[PDB]
C-alpha cells in the first residue's frame, strides 16, 4: 500500500548478429552452438552484485530498455518469457531463478568458458561451463520468431565471443551435429556486434535519435514460388520457342568458342571438347530436347506472370542483321548468328524488372526442390554435408549470384524485344513503425520567439514541428489538432490534415523550426531558406491560439536517424545567423545549464484503467440483490453504427490474489467449513447474442504484454524447466507461463444465437496451489497447478459481437468464500461478498510515454583477432533510484514522477507521515525507518 524506493544498477545487452530459427520449408539448420569466455569481473562494485548472464533470446519479444521495467529493474537475460539465461548458479526464465546442481557451483569468474547449444527439432537449450554440463535444461518453448545469442551485463565486466572458427576458436569441441554460429551469417551482411534495440546513438555532432528497425521473420527464409508449368502456350511452343532455342544455342557455342573450349566429336571436358561442335543444333538430341524445355518453361513463366505474350514484326527481326560474325569461330562450328537486338530495341526499365522477377522465380523453384531434398544453408560450401551457401531466397541473395542468374535472361529478353514481344507488367504493428520524441512538459512556452533545428541524416519519413502537452502517443503527428508539424519526405504541412507545402528534403539538410507566439506564426526554413507555400505565404501556419503551450516534437519512421539541436550552444547552431538571429528569435534552451530531458513513446503494452469518457466502451457497477451477487458489466456504446470499431479486448481486474508461501496441503453452508475453507469463487457470464467462441476466461500474471489482435489459446507463452540428476533422469519439471485461461467455444461445441447466457466459474485454491474451471455447474477437464508466492489477476479476452457482452460476477458458492476475502486482509473472514471502490476493470493499451535516461552505459566492442574473436567491455558505473509499485510487481524511475502528479503527491504525503511517526524523539521508530530509507538513498 506504499511505494518502495531503492537504488539499482544499469544493465545492458549485446547480441552477436546471428538469427536462427525454423519453420515449414525453411532453408536453415535446426542445431546451433556458440561460446563465450570471461576475462575480467569486478564483484560488488557500486555496492551491488555485478550482472552477467549468457544465453539465447527471441526477436519478437525480447526488447529491454535502459529504464527499470518489471520487478525491481535491471532486466537482462531470463527476466522475460522470451529469453533464457545462465549466471553460474541458476537458470533464468520468467524472472524466476531456479538453482542448478552444476559440478562447480560457483558464480561466473575470470577464466570461465561457457558453451551454449540450441536444438530446434525438439526445443531445448543446454549450457556447459569449462566442459562440465549443467543438470537443468529449458524445454517446450514457443518456436515463433528467430533466436540469437545474447549477453546481459552491468558495468565492470569484460567478455569475448568465440563465434565459430573465423572469429575466435572453440576451447572445447562442439557436440556432434551442432553447427557453429559463424555459419549462419547472411551473404549480404558481415559479422558485427550490436545492441538489441535502441532509440538513440552516439554521433560526431551529438546524439542521433533513431527510430524502429526492420527485423526479419522466421517465414522469410521459406521459398514461395508460382506454379508456372501448369500454364501451356502451344502457339509459341510450336515455332517461337525453337527460335529462342536456336539463339540460345548460338550464345552457348559462342561462349565455348570465346573460351579455350575445343572441338571434339565426343564430350571431353578434359581436352575441352565440344560434344556437338555443330552450328545448327541436332534436334533429335535429348540435350536439344532439354533446351526445348528451357524455352517452354520460360514462356510458361512469362504467361503465368502478368506478361502478355505475342508476335509483332517478326519479319523485322528476320530482316535485320541476324548473322553477325566475328570471324574468330572454330572451323568445326559454322557462322554463329548474333541478332544484336539491343541496337534495334533497348531493354526498358519494365523489361529489366521482368528479367529480375523471372530470375527470382527460377531461383525460388530451385530453392524449393533443394529444401525438398533436405539441404540447408551454410556460410561455407559443403556438398557431402548438404549445405549450400546459395539456397537463401532471391531477396537475400547477393548481387553476384543475381547477375549470374540474370545475364542469360537479359539475352533472352533482348531476343524477345527483337522479335517484338508485347509483354506488359501486371494494429499492433502500426505502433512498431513510428517513434515520437518530445521535450518534457515543464518546458512549455506561451510567449516569445523560439527557434530550434533538426537534421535528417537518413532520407526518409520524419515529421518535425511543435506539439501540445496533451499530445497522445498512439496518434500520428498532425492527424489531430495537437500538433503543427512538417513532413519533409513528401513536402506536406500537417495539422488536422495534410496539405502540400515546401519541397522534399535531402540527406544532411537541416530544417529550422521557428515559432512566434506574439504573431501566432510558424516558419520552417530549409538550409537557411524559408520554405514557400503554394499561395505565396512565408508562414506555414497562422492564426494559432496560444492555448496551454507548445513543445518541440519530432517523429521518425522505420530505419531512420535524425539529429535534434535545441540550441544549448549557439556555436553548434547552423543557419541560425542566416535566419532567426536578427529577427528576434532565440534558440530553445539557450541559458539552460543542463540538457533538456526528452520523453519517447515506449511501445510496451500495459494494463490501464478504462477511461469514463471512452466513446466505444462503458462499464457499469451493478449492486447486489437477494439472489444476485455484485457484478461489473461491460457494454458497447457505439454498437451497430457506421462509425464503430470492433477489435479484440483484453480486460483484467485491478487487484490480485496471492498464493501461500508454503503449500501445507489443504444451500445451507456449515460454519466450520466456512471458516476452515481455502478455495475461492469467481464467475463470468457471457450474455445471449455474444458468441461463446470469442471469449476466453481465466487468470493472468503481472507480466502480460502481448497485444496480438488474432489471439488464440495456442499463442500463449509456455516453458518447462527440467532439473535432472547426474544420471540424467529428471527429478523436477516446472512449467512457467503467463496466461491460464479456457476457451468458451469448448463448452458450446457440445451444445446460432442461443437465449441462455453462459456462466463459467473459476475455482481457485491458495493452499494446494490449483485452479479448476466449471461451466453451467458442469465439471470440466481443465486443471492448472502453480508454484507458491504467485499472484494472479482475473481477466477476460473478448471479441465484441453484441450490444451486451460480459459480466464479471463476484459472489460465493456453497461452502466457498468469495473473492473479497482473498483480495482484502480486513475482510479475510467475511462470507458476504462486496465490491469496494478499489476493485476495477482495466484494459490493455498498446503505447505509453516514457522518460529517457540522462546518461547511458558506455560499452566498447571490437575484435582482437582470429585467435581471440570479438571483445566487449564496460567499466563506467551508472546507477538510478527506482520507485516500486507493490501490487503490480513493477518499478519505475523516481524522476518519472515529474509528470505523474498523483503518485508524486502520494509519495510526498508518505514522506510526511514518515517524519511524523518518528517526530519528537522516537528513536525506537527512527531506527526502524532505516530499514525502509537508508543512508545511500538519502545521500543520492
Amino acid at each position, epitope marked *: 500500500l506504499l511505494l518502495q524506493t531503492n537504488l539499482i544498477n544499469y544493465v545492458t545487452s549485446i547480441r552477436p548478429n546471428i538469427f536462427v530459427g525454423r519453420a515449414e520449408g525453411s532453408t536453415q539448420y535446426g542445431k546451433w552452438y556458440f561460446e563465450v569466455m570471461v576475462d575480467e569481473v569486478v564483484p560488488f562494485l557500486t555496492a551491488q552484485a555485478t550482472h552477467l548472464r549468457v544465453g539465447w533470446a527471441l526477436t519478437e519479444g525480447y526488447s529491454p530498455y535502459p529504464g527499470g521495467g518489471e520487478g525491481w529493474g535491471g532486466n537482462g537475460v531470463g527476466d522475460d518469457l522470451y529469453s533464457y539465461g545462465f549466471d553460474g548458479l541458476h537458470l533464468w526464465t520468467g524472472h524466476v531463478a531456479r538453482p542448478v546442481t552444476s559440478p562447480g557451483q560457483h558464480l561466473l569468474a575470470p577464466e570461465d568458458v561457457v558453451s551454449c547449444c540450441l536444438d530446434l527439432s525438439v526445443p531445448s537449450i543446454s549450457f556447459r561451463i569449462n566442459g562440465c554440463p549443467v543438470q537443468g535444461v529449458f524445454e517446450a518453448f514457443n518456436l515463433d520468431g528467430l533466436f540469437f545469442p545474447v549477453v546481459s551485463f552491468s558495468a565492470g565486466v569484460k567478455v569475448r565471443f568465440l563465434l565459430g572458427g573465423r572469429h575466435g576458436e572453440f576451447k572445447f569441441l562442439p557436440p556432434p551435429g551442432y553447427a557453429p554460429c559463424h555459419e549462419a551469417v547472411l551473404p549480404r551482411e558481415r559479422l558485427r556486434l550490436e545492441p538489441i534495440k535502441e532509440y538513440r546513438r552516439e554521433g560526431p555532432r551529438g546524439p542521433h535519435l533513431v527510430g524502429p528497425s526492420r527485423c526479419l521473420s522466421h517465414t522469410d527464409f521459406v521459398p514461395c514460388p508460382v506454379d508456372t508449368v501448369q500454364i501451356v502456350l502451344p502457339p509459341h511452343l510450336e515455332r517461337i520457342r525453337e527460335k529462342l532455342a536456336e539463339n*540460345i*544455342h548460338e*550464345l*552457348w557455342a559462342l561462349t565455348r568458342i570465346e573460351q579455350g573450349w575445343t572441338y571434339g566429336p*565426343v*564430350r*571431353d*571436358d*578434359n581436352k575441352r571438347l565440344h*560434344p556437338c561442335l555443330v552450328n545448327f543444333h541436332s534436334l533429335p*538430341e*535429348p*540435350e536439344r530436347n*532439354y*533446351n526445348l*524445355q*528451357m524455352s517452354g518453361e520460360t514462356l510458361k513463366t512469362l504467361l503465368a506472370l502478368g506478361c502478355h505474350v505475342g508476335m509483332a514484326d517478326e519479319k523485322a527481326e528476320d530482316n535485320l542483321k541476324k548473322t553477325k560474325l566475328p570471324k574468330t569461330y572454330m572451323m568445326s562450328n559454322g557462322y554463329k548468328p548474333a541478332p544484336l537486338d539491343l541496337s534495334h530495341v533497348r531493354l526498358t526499365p519494365a523489361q529489366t524488372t521482368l528479367v529480375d522477377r523471372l530470375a527470382e522465380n*527460377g*531461383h525460388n523453384v*530451385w530453392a524449393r*526442390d*533443394r529444401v*525438398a*531434398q533436405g539441404w540447408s544453408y551454410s556460410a561455407v560450401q559443403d*556438398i557431402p554435408a548438404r549445405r*549450400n551457401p*546459395r*539456397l537463401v531466397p532471391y531477396r537475400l541473395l547477393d548481387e553476384a*549470384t543475381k547477375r*549470374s*542468374n540474370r*545475364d*542469360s535472361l537479359c539475352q533472352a529478353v533482348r531476343t524477345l524485344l527483337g522479335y517484338g514481344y508485347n509483354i506488359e507488367p501486371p494494429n499492433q504493428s502500426r505502433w512498431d513503425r513510428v517513434r515520437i520524441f518530445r521535450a518534457e512538459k515543464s518546458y512549455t512556452v506561451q510567449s516569445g520567439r523560439w527557434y530550434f533545428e533538426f537534421e535528417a541524416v537518413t532520407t526518409g519519413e520524419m515529421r518535425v514541428g511543435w506539439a501540445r502537452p496533451e499530445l497522445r502517443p498512439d496518434v500520428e503527428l498532425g492527424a489531430d489538432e495537437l500538433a503543427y508539424v512538417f513532413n519533409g519526405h513528401r513536402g506536406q504541412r500537417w495539422h488536422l490534415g495534410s496539405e502540400p507545402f515546401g519541397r522534399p528534403w535531402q540527406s544532411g539538410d537541416v530544417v529550422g523550426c521557428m515559432i512566434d507566439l506574439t504573431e501566432n506564426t510558424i516558419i520552417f526554413t530549409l538550409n537557411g531558406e524559408v520554405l514557400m507555400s503554394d499561395s505565396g505565404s512565408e508562414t506555414a501556419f497562422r492564426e494559432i491560439e496560444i492555448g496551454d503551450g507548445f513543445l518541440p516534437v519530432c517523429s521518425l519512421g522505420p530505419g531512420q536517424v535524425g539529429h535534434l539541436n535545441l540550441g544549448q550552444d549557439v556555436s553548434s547552431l547552423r543557419f541560425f545567423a542566416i535566419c532567426g538571429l536578427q529577427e528576434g528569435f532565440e534558440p530553445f534552451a539557450i541559458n539552460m545549464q543542463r540538457p533538456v530531458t526528452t520523453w519517447f513513446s515506449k511501445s510496451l503494452p500495459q494494463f490501464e484503467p478504462v477511461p469514463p469518457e471512452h466513446p466505444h466502451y462503458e462499464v457499469a457497477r451493478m449492486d447486489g440483490t437477494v439472489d444476485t451477487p455484485p457484478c461489473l458489466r461491460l457494454a458497447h456504446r457505439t454498437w451497430g453504427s457506421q462509425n464503430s470499431l470492433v477489435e479484440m479486448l483484453f480486460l483484467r481486474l485491478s487487484l490480485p490474489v496471492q498464493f501461500h508461501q508454503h503449500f501445507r496441503c489443504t444451500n445451507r453452508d456449515d460454519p466450520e467449513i466456512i471458516l476452515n475453507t481455502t478455495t475461492y469463487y469467481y464467475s463470468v457470464r457471457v450474455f445471449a447474442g455474444q458468441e461463446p467462441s470469442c471469449v476466453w476466461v481465466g487468470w493472468v500474471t503481472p507480466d502480460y504484454h502481448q497485444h496480438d489482435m488474432n489471439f488464440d489459446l495456442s499463442k500463449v507463452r509456455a516453458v518447462t524447466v527440467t532439473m535432472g540428476d547426474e544420471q540424467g533422469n529428471v527429478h523436477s519439471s516446472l512449467k512457467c507461463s503467463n496466461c491460464y485461461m479456457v476457451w468458451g467455444g469448448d463448452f458450446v461445441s457440445p451444445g446460432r444465437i442461443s437465449h441462455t447466457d453462459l456462466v463459467i466459474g473459476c475455482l481457485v485454491d491458495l493452499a494446494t496451489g490449483l485452479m479448476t474451471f466449471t461451466a453451467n455447474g458442469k465439471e470440466s477437464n481443465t486443471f492448472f497447478q502453480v508454484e507458491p508466492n504467485t499472484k494472479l489477476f482475473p481477466a477476460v479476452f473478448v471479441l465484441p459481437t453484441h450490444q451486451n457482452v460480459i459480466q464479471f460476477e463476484l459472489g460465493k458458492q456453497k461452502n466457498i468464500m468469495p473473492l473479497s476475502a482473498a483480495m482484502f486482509l480486513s475482510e479475510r473472514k467475511n462470507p458476504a461478498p462486496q465490491c469496494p471502490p478499489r476493485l476495477e476493470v482495466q484494459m490493455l493499451m498498446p503505447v505509453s510515454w516514457s522518460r529517457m535516461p540522462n546518461h547511458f552505459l558506455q560499452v566498447e566492442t571490437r575484435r582482437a583477432g582470429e585467435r581471440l574473436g570479438w571483445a566487449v567491455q564496460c567499466q563506467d558505473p551508472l546507477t538510478m533510484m527506482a520507485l516500486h509499485i507493490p501490487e503490480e510487481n513493477r518499478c519505475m524511475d523516481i524522476l518519472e514522477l515529474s509528470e505523474r502528479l498523483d503518485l508524486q503527491r502520494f509519495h510526498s504525503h508518505t514522506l510526511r507521515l514518515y517524519r511524523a511517526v518518528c517526530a519528537l524523539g522516537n528513536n525506537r521508530v527512527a531506527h526502524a525507518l532505516c530499514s525502509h530509507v537508508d543512508q545511500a538513498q538519502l545521500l543520492h
Partner: nanobody
Amino acid sequence: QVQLQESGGGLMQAGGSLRLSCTASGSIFSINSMGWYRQAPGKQRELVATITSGNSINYADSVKGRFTISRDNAKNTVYLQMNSLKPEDTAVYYCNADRVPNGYNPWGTPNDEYDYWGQGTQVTVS
C-alpha cells in the same frame, strides 16, 4: 524428389569384376547424364565417366583401366562394370543424376546447382 540408390563395388582382389547397379526413382522430368563421382578418403573428389541419355559417355583422367558403363532410360538404371582393380582406386562412389545433359547447362548457376545427389557405396581394393 529423385533418389539415386546405388549398390555394388564389392571388395575383392585385383583383377576382379565389380558390377554396380544405380537406379534413379522419382519425377519423370529431367533425367539425363546420370553419372558417377569418386572420392578417396582424405583426398579430392573426381568425376568418373558419366553416361548420358542416348549412350554418350563423358570421360576424365580416372577412366583408365577396364571400365564399361551402360544405361537404360526406361527405368533410369546404370550397370557400371569395372574389371581393373588398382590399390589407388579405393574410394567412396556416388551416383548423381541431374537435368543437365551432356555436362552442359545453358542457364548458368541455377541449373548448375540443380543437381540430384543420391546415396552412394564404398569401393575398396586389397
